[PDB]
Structures are given as structure tokens and as C-alpha cells.
Design a protein around this ligand. Structure first.
Ligand SMILES: [Zn+2]
Ligand SMILES: [Zn+2]
Ligand SMILES: [Zn+2]
Ligand SMILES: [Zn+2]
Ligand SMILES: [Zn+2]
Ligand SMILES: [Zn+2]
Ligand SMILES: [Zn+2]
Ligand SMILES: [Zn+2]
Lengths: 360, 360, 360, 360
């Protein structure tokens, strides 16, 4: 069977909305269709040919892009969980055979490649294509009927849910809370201000943190209004440098910013490294920096990807925010594009939060 | 009264053995004297004037040095735990008022200076003087009467015990062990080879790791034998660079070395930053270094001090080790100096691991 | 000054809505008045004279009842959290000196009476009175303006939240989840059909469990509709006895019912004991029952009270629930009484879930 | 092949030392013989036909007994850990495919019989036989050459190390320690005085608890000195009942004794149920009993088996105990039987703590 799809040639790079030949399967559990698809710097990165670990599935010449999906079930085997017309989010990372992979924690794989594989990124076709085939275990059912396009933010949000679990593990080193058991006054600072930063901030707000997003420039008003709505502050760190940080999260991947901010972190502080950029210039870390970290019992936790449970938590969080802030949540999506507007892979509008592809 | 002591002028530096007027405090439960005091880079740093966070007590001009102590109780009020003639190890760090301090976790003080104080380093008189006064709760009784001078290693070891608690805490983020529940074949690498590296390595072996100590040069036969006695490996990383590290503990405090090794750490790897050196040159950390740490879910934790429980577990490990390998344990204590010999704070004795001051 | 208050003579019994002496205190940060006050088996129990561990404050021959409050501020010392006009839920348990009390976990006090105290129960006037004095610290702000009278359910729900933390802690002894990381299909059974049962059920659903409430009698349509709306099931256990239980929660206090459901619990199951009935009769537990608990690595855990963080967390779940389902959440509050209707402390009003007192 | 073995008919019972025909499988990594085999209640029970959950391996009309083994490697494929001549302790319980089994925590199997199987007990041949084939990974190496026969206590001790993990996991629901961070004066009571109860007491001593073993009768003078030499107290609870218990361990399996001691447990106290007895009578558990558990936040945790890591810990503790109290440790082994002495499965030889069979 022949369909439309947005493909790349991984890692060489490039983008193309074209038609490819998809065969059928033998014994398939599920047939699905895209409805919305989100995009982040990973996609623009793949297209730029800036990612050195990505590849096409074995034997093939191309890779179908897209990992942030919101699908609908075209057909399924009988099961207690989903049926035709239900809406689902698909799992990006699939398990291998390592001690972590065999228990649904492929996000914490002990080998790396090629034990596990990410859809749209590493040797496994993504979701920007008219027809998709999968197993029910890999699908996370959207139970909230009112969510609509908002559900597509599940994929990006689950990364934050995992990272926050990693926080909960590692903050058990000491008592992070107050005298009274609470997070009140506790300070989170999120580097950057794109969708991820937003999600990170929203969740920290749920967790009781006082949250400030930050950048090396003033932001657009839509973003400013968004941060305002949810009780999130903002600071241009060239004008006003936030001090006394309890939880620091980097979505930038930039060492100068990271470590500059690392030096503002309080005793028992936790820093989460999430954002990545292979090209970022080196920043000189010295004896005093390491001493700073050590003398304060600080933890720097790199975090990547997530387990299925974290997709469930992501969806339940989007429900809570929807029914409390319907409008402004809607406005996390800052542009909706047809599949042939491939310019979105190369462009970077001021004001962007999330860009999605409404699928025909 | 007038007593003899070895003192410095914190943070400026220098040392002397001399008489000082030490007034008997207002309240106290215990009156003691030293038997042995160990020294390390901290003591030497204090004297070199290389530490800017140190300071003499209030109203006073000098600072009695010494944190690594083994004392004998001269007199003590009636209690259930210690009797006159008992030997004990004193707490370095004393609690302030924060939420970690007030539960006995001043090692994880939420404020830092000046909520917590450390005897001999920060505004609190150390243990190289004739008479010392204290509270019973701040004294850790030595139960094993065979340890003698070995008990003086309680202080340096307790920092290792806390660094291992931290490993136990942050390792719960994934499943670290093999799929048989054990740590067998899991590669622990320790940068450096001094007293702290040894203590690390011995505890690491007790925890079930394959342990390799490393340095930028080959080691003495005497130290090799000691290592070999505990089944600990040694490698010159300029002649044979270890790879696939699961637990990395640095005692150098050197950024370039720290990050060179970080780049060999496996998925789910944990890096303990322990060793500090403010004057260590700057190493440029780039976007790939950050990405490495991110894609591998690696945790970098800095660790300082310990709780009283860690002293208790330190003493017990010394007991287990001494009764298994008396000779190797004796071999750590490589010189027994008199107080008059203040030069030991300036020049490093021939083949040092642990230098100690026997107190008259 | 003279105020109105509902009061008892504890532990003796009885209740009256009367007038009382209230001297304006010296030391107070805040001045509040009740808006709504809820009641439960505890309130009836005190009034019935059935709780032998309750008592009046020192040198007073009455105890103002009421522990489940929604208050409004009248005057407050300057501070960045709460202002005149704000609504707040007061803390019930107050901390003493123990190692858990001093870190805001009076909930887990390690001493019991008289190191800790509960408003309305043990030595501390409750909240059914015209004027309350308190400290800012003991008050939790309600930030959701739509919540109104639904916030009064905070005190009951925070006990659930704590029990789930208890579950979250003890369930770490093994891997409780599916090999997909999820709780999908994990069976939760709540003994009882009361307000507490419902609260647990809703939290359990939020947690991913299949949840079933059980009583020894059939239920109403008012109640069943409410359960259905939240995806919660119901079964009369005389007609159908649930099996294969992963998390059992008892709100009844009845041995016979507890241990009968205990013997339907899976390997690694957790049982939460929450409800209390000192008057419930013995049920013979034999060695075979014990062996059953052992061989399945089952945990049986008592949970009482909660910490401030669990109030905050409670309030946040109620907004979530109210905003997803305003109907059935309104439907929890089955009667609004005036203070003079002191008959609600003797007779279960008709079809009760939660009886509140709307204050003048 | 035809070899000597001690066998039963599970579950009917019965025992004899005889000749049997054991095949060698098409796959195995190691070939071993026994050196020492321990016996406990489970063996005696098996013989009496008191355990209907026991059964012979698939296709066989008999069950080779014995699960507490010290074996020696006769031949083993090349590997980095064990060689011909080394002494090992074989794994009892072997995993299936449940989420816990597949990561080497078959001790916490989510399914039970038959995911998992125990050697000498459930569908898997035991260790009282001339020749044993196994895979390397089911073997745990004895690295202390001095331990000799004492290494046979590994199997009953590892059950103690796992129950202490359980205690560690569940005592995290609050702060269990004193406010100095220690366990000093924390009160451990162990019900019973058998081998299992000694093992619990010594580990408890290492963990910092003040420990007492109890029974409903006086104990032998030899037992008393052994206790005394480790600093463990004894008490006849019919003359002197302990109160204010922090850790309670039951090795009896008797309800009446469990629940009357539970009644002496402090706030945040932990109860471990370990001991089993299908024939112990019912004790009537009332709502006061349930109320006492709930009000004190007590946790009652059933514990069975252990992971491989716990066999390594047991081995390490035995080394530590043996090297500091050689005599007391040897006294634990109170009879060394020939395999012809099958009467030991029917009668307990006099003053028994641990009976072992010395294999020829
Ligand atoms: Zn993305
Ligand atoms: Zn894997
Ligand atoms: Zn030192
Ligand atoms: Zn502090
Ligand atoms: Zn209540
Ligand atoms: Zn308390
Ligand atoms: Zn046994
Ligand atoms: Zn299993």
C-alpha cells in the first residue's frame, strides 16, 4: 500500500513530504492514523543532519520522522483497553533485553544502542505517515474526552515527568523540604523558554515550587501572558540574575549557562540536565566550581526519555491543567501546519511554544 | 587554664606548638584528652593559608587545628554509654538549627556556614590540645579494644560511608545491579591513591564492586601489596585507561581528570565528587560532555561530611578489616609524629598514606 | 470576649451549642472564623464518650469540637503567603519536640500524647467557635477561588494522601508494577462505602488502580452514580467476594472483615489499616493466616493523620476533581447543618456521605 | 548417573538415604559435590508430610532433600569468578518469568508457585546428593578460606539479610533513628531462640539495636553464654515481659505470641513476621488491637526468602562474626551427622541449634 509521510535520511539529514510504499503486516494488533504531531529541536536537529546517533531502519534508505504523536485507532484486535476510534499516544522508545528494558524501563537502558530503539530517531520509523501499525502495549489511551489536540503534548511532557521522578529519587539524599514538610518558598529555575521549559515550569508549579523561567533576552508577550497565567515568573539573566536556586533545570544544553547557574544553587540543590547541543562551546570548569558542588552536597542528574507510566502521568496532568485553564493551555500550541509546510523544520519563529502538524 | 596545643591563624595560615589560655567552658558533660590525631590535605591547606572559608572562634585570635581525633575520657557525668578511661572519636561537624541539622544531619545542612560548625576548621577549636571539653552526644565510643591507633582513621572513613549512602540513594533511579541482584563485575574506579582512595576502595570491595584505583603514575610496591591484599586493582591511566565504569569516585578534585573519566562511565553510572582543590585549573566542558551525561542517565553527586551514624559504621569497618588483614590496616598509618614536629604540616613525609600525631 | 461554640466534655461525652468565655490572646499571628466545618465518626465518637484518649485543654472543663475546617482570615501579621480575606484549612495535629515533630511530621510523632496534640481531640480547642487564633504556619491557603465549600473536605482527604505515601514507601520493597512500568490492572479494594472510602477510591483511580468499594450491604443509586462517574466499582461482598487484591484499604476497623480480605491479597500486596473501632469483636487469626502473610511478602501498615504537605496535596486533588466533575463532588456534601442541630452527632442523617456545618 | 542421595516423597513425606539415578542435563556450566548440608524446620516438616505445597520435580517419583548447602566445585567451564576447588553456596529459589524473577528478585515473585522453584522443596532437586550440576550464576563463592563449615549457615542467614532489607525499606515512612542520627537504645525483640533467632539477633546487633531474644521458658546455659558473648539479652517473657519495642521479629509463627508482643511496640515500630506454623492456634484479634496498630503508625511486614545479594551479605557477616568470636560461631553447629542418620529428620538432636549433615 502507498501513503504520504514526512521522511528524512538519517543521519545525512534533510526533510521531504512525499509518498512511500508501506506493506502490510502478518499478525498485527493495531492499525492507526495520525491526527496531530508535535515537533521540537530533535526534529530540526535531525533535518539539519546535526545528530550523529540517528539512523534509518535496517535495509531501508530513509526514516519517517515524528515521535510526538496523537493517534486514533483505525482497527484493533479485541482487548479490554482500546477499540476503533479511540485516541492514543504511542511509545517513542521500545524495550530491548537488559535488566531495565525487561521491566518497562527502557528509558533507563543499561546498554544503550542497539538494545533499545526510538521511533523517528533510531532505526525505527516515526509517526508522520498516513498509516501506522503497532502493539497495544505500546499505546497509551487518551481517557479524557475534552483534551483534543492538547493530548499531543503527551510525548514532550512525559520526559519532564521522568526527570521529576529522578528528582524525587535523588532529593531523598537529605530533607529537601521545609520545617513544615512543604515546598513553599522552594525555588525552581528553568533555563530557557520553549515548550519544554514551559512544561517543566508547569509541573514544578504543581509540585509547590516557586518557578522562574530564564533566557539571555526578553521574551514575546504571548509567552509573558502564558507565564503570568500559570504563576510562572521570568527573568532576563543579563538584566537580573536569579540567586539561591533549590532546583535547576537546563533545557538549553549550554555549559556556560549551566555552570554559571550551577554557582547559584543552594545547599542540597539538584540540577537536572535535559537539553542537549553537541555544538555548544566549552566553558572552563575549575577547582572552585567542583568544590562548590561538593561542599554543598549538590546533585547533577542527567535525565533522558521515559517509561510508559510517565505517559499516563503526562496525560492526567494535561487533564488537570485543561479543566483549570482551558484557553491558555490551548495557546501552548502556537502554530498549526499542514504536512507540506516543511519549512517549520527549518524556521524558528519568535513566540513559538509548540508547533504541530494537523494531519489530514 | 594553660594547656599546650598546635595552632594556626585562620584563614591566614602558619602553625606553632605552644601554650594557650583555654578557659573551661560554662557547661559540658565530658573532659578529655587526645591520644592520636590524623592529618590530611585539609590540615595542610589551613596552614598554607589556602582556604578562605575558615576562621578562628569568636573573640579569639588563633585556631586549634585537628579534626581526625581519637580521645580518652578523663572525666564524664553519670550516663549509660561512656565511662572515664573510655576511648572515643569526636564529631567534627556540630549541628545548627535547620531541618537537617536538628535531626542529626548537619552533614546535609540546608544553610551551610554559619548554621553548622566544624571543629578545627570553622570557628571551633580542633583536637590538637591537651584538654578538650564536649557533650556526650558528640562522642562516638570505640567498642573494639583491639583497634588502638587504627580507630583514629574513623574520621576519613566516615566521609566514605556517607559518600556510599549517597550512592545508595541516587542509584535507586534505575536498576544498577545485574539481573541476579548483585554488583558482581560492576566496575568501580577511584581516581588517586592516598588515604581516602584506599578507604573508598576497601568499602567498595565490601559492597561487591571490582575496584580499580588509578593515578597518572605508577605506585610503590608497598601500596601494591596493600591493594593486592584486599583484591583491589591498580592502574596508571596514562599507560592503561579504564573503560566502562559503573561507579566513579574522584579524590583529585581536578576538573580535567574528573571529566576525562566521566566519558568512560556506563549508562546509569554514578560519579561521586569528593576530593576538592580550589586552585585546580579550568577544564573546558563542551556540549558533547553534557550530552554524554544526558543520554546515559548519569548522576554526578558531590559529597561532604557525615552523620554520627557514619562514624559508628566507620569504626565497625575498621574492626572487620583489622581482624581480616591486620598488617594491611597497620600499613595505612605510615608515620607517628610528635606535636613538636609541626613541619609535617609543611612537608609530606616519605611515602605517606596517613600521618598521625601521637599526643603525650 | 464571648463567642458561640459547639463543645464536648472529653473524654466524658455529650455535646452542646453554647456560649463561652474567650480571652483575646497575647501571642497570635492570625485571627480567623469558620465558614464550614465537617464531621465524621470521630466527632460522633467523641460526643458518644467512646474515645478514651481524648481530653480538655489544661484547666478547662470543656473541649470545643471540630477538626475538619474551612476558615477565613480576619487579621494576619504581615507575611508573603496569606492576607485578610483569605481562605485556609487549618492543621489538626500540632508538633511537639520529637525528631518527627520538629521537621513537620507530627503525623509520625515517635512519642504520642503528650508530645503532639490534635485540634478538637486532644488538649486543644477545635474549630466550631466564632473566633480562632493561630499561627500562619499551621494554616494552608486555598488558592483555587472556585473551590468554595468543597475545600472543607481537605482534612479528611489528607489522611488518604498520607496513607498513599505510606503505600508508596513500603511498596518499594519489591517491584509492584507491571513489566510495562504501569499500574494498569492492579486491583484496589476499599472496605467501606463512606466518605473516607470514596476519598481513597478517587485517589486510587488517580493512581491507575482498578478500584472497587465494598460493603456488607447493597448501595444507593445516589452513591452508585457517584462511583460510576469516577470509574469506581462496587460490590456487596456477601453476594460477590473480590479476589486477587493488590492494595487493600480498610476504613471499617473490623478484624473479621480485615483478615477475610487479607486472604484475598496477592504476593507483594499492601494492606492499609486506617479505620478504627475499639468496640469491634475478636476474629481468630491462626498460624495459617500468618503463614499466608509471610509467604506472600505482604505488608500490613497502620496509617494515622497527615502532614501539612498532604493538606496542600489534598486541596490540589479537589480542584482537579471538582473541575473535571463538579456534580458528583458537590454531591459528597450531603447535608449543610446549622450549629444548633447538634443531633447530627448522634444520628446518621439520611444517605450520608459528608455532613458539614455552615457557620454564621 | 547413579549416585547416593537423601530423599523424600513430596508432599507425602518420608525419608531415606539411598541410591538414585540422576541424569546430567544437556546444558550446564558447573559440576559440584556437597561438603556440608544444614537442616531446619522445613526439612523436618517435609518428612512428616506437613507441607502440601511441596512437590517432586516434573516427571520424578521422589524429591532430593536439602537446601542449606556448602558445595565444592569439581569442574566448571572457564569464567572469571569460580574455579575447580572453590567452595560455594548454591541458590535455593530459582526464578521464573515474573517482573521480579527476571531481575533476580525471585524472593519477591509476583506470581508464586509455579513462577519460582525452591531446591529441596518445590519441583527442584535439593543438595543432599553426591553430584550436583548448576549454572555459575546460581552459585555464590566463598572468598574467606578460613570459614570452613561455618559457610553452611549462609542459607538460613540470607533470609535474615532480606528481612533486614524489608525493615530498611519500610522504616523510611518516617524517621526511625534518634535525633543524633543513630540507632542507640533502639529496642529489638526477637521471638524465639532457635538458630533463626540467633541469626536475627546478631545482624540486629550489627545494625546498632539493643537486642533481646525471648521465649516462654528458660534457655540452656550454653545458649545463654553464646548470647552473652555477642551482647544479646535473653528473657523468659512469662517472668519478664519486654515493653517499648522498636523492632519486633517473630520466628515462632504463633498468633497469640505475635499479637501480644505487637501490643508492646512503640510509635513507628516495625514488626517482621518470619517464622511459620500452620498448626498454631487462633488468637482473637479485636478492634482495640487494630486501633493500636493504626494509632501508632506500626508496620507489619511478612518476609520470605532472599535474593542472591543477600547470600553475599550473609557470607560477609559470617566472616566478620567468625573472625571476632570464633567459639560462639562454631557452637551454632551443634551436631555433624552422617547421611545414614535420617533419624535427625524426626527428632531434634539434643540442645540443637543447627544440625548439619557432613557428606562423605
Ligand atoms: Zn520532540
Ligand atoms: Zn536495554
Ligand atoms: Zn582530614
Ligand atoms: Zn543546618
Ligand atoms: Zn473527621
Ligand atoms: Zn512528636
Ligand atoms: Zn532451612
Ligand atoms: Zn516470578
Amino acid at each position: 500500500s502507498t501513503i504520504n509521510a514526512i521522511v528524512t535520511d538519517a543521519p545525512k539529514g534533510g526533510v521531504k513530504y512525499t509518498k512511500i510504499d508501506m506493506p502490510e503486516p502478518e499478525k498485527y494488533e493495531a492499525k492507526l492514523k495520525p491526527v496531530y504531531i508535535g515537533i521540537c529541536g530533535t526534529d530540526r536537529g535531525e533535518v539539519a543532519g546535526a545528530l550523529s546517533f540517528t539512523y534509518n531502519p535496517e535495509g531501508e534508505n530513509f526514516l519517517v520522522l515524528g515521535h510526538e504523536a496523537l493517534l486514533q485507532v483505525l482497527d484493533v484486535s479485541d482487548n479490554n483497553y482500546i477499540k476503533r476510534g479511540d485516541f492514543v499516544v504511542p511509545l517513542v522508545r521500545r524495550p530491548g533485553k537488559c535488566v531495565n528494558c525487561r521491566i518497562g524501563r527502557q528509558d533507563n537502558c543499561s546498554i544503550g544502542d542497539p538494545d533499545k530503539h526510538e521511533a523517528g530517531i533510531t532505526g525505527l520509523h516515526g509517526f508522520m505517515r498516513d498509516v501506522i501499525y503497532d502493539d497495544i502495549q505500546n499505546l497509551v489511551k487518551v481517557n479524557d474526552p475534552d483534551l483534543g489536540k492538547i493530548a499531543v503534548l503527551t510525548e514532550p511532557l512525559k520526559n519532564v515527568m521522568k526527570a521529576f521522578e529522578v528528582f524525587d529519587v535523588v532529593s531523598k539524599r537529605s530533607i529537601f523540604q521545609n520545617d513544615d514538610s512543604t515546598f513553599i518558598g522552594k525555588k525552581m529555575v528553568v533555563i530557557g523558554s520553549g515548550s519544554e521549559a514551559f512544561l517543566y515550569s508547569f509541573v514544578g508549579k504543581d509540585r509547590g515550587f516557586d518557578v522562574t523561567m530564564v533566557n539571555r533576552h526578553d521574551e514575546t508577550e504571548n509567552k509573558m501572558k502564558m507565564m503570568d497565567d500559570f504563576g510562572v515568573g521570568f527573568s532576563n539573566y543579563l538584566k537580573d540574575m536569579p540567586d539561591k536556586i533549590d532546583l535547576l533545570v537546563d533545557t538549553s544544553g549550554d555549559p556556560s549557562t549551566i555552570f554559571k547557574f550551577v554557582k547559584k544553587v543552594n545547599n542540597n540543590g539538584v540540577v537536572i540536565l535535559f537539553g542537549t547541543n553537541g555544538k555548544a562551546p566549552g566553558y572552563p570548569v575549575n577547582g572552585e566550581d567542583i568544590d562548590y558542588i561538593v561542599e554543598r552536597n549538590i546533585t547533577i542528574a542527567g535525565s533522558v526519555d521515559a517509561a510508559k507510566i510517565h505517559y499516563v502521568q503526562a496525560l492526567d496532568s494535561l487533564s488537570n491543567w485543561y479543566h483549570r485553564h482551558p484557553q491558555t493551555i490551548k495557546d501552548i500550541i502556537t502554530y498549526e501546519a499542514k504536512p507540506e509546510e516543511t519549512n517549520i523544520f527549518f524556521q524558528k519563529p519568535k513566540g513559538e511554544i509548540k508547533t504541530v502538524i494537523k494531519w489530514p
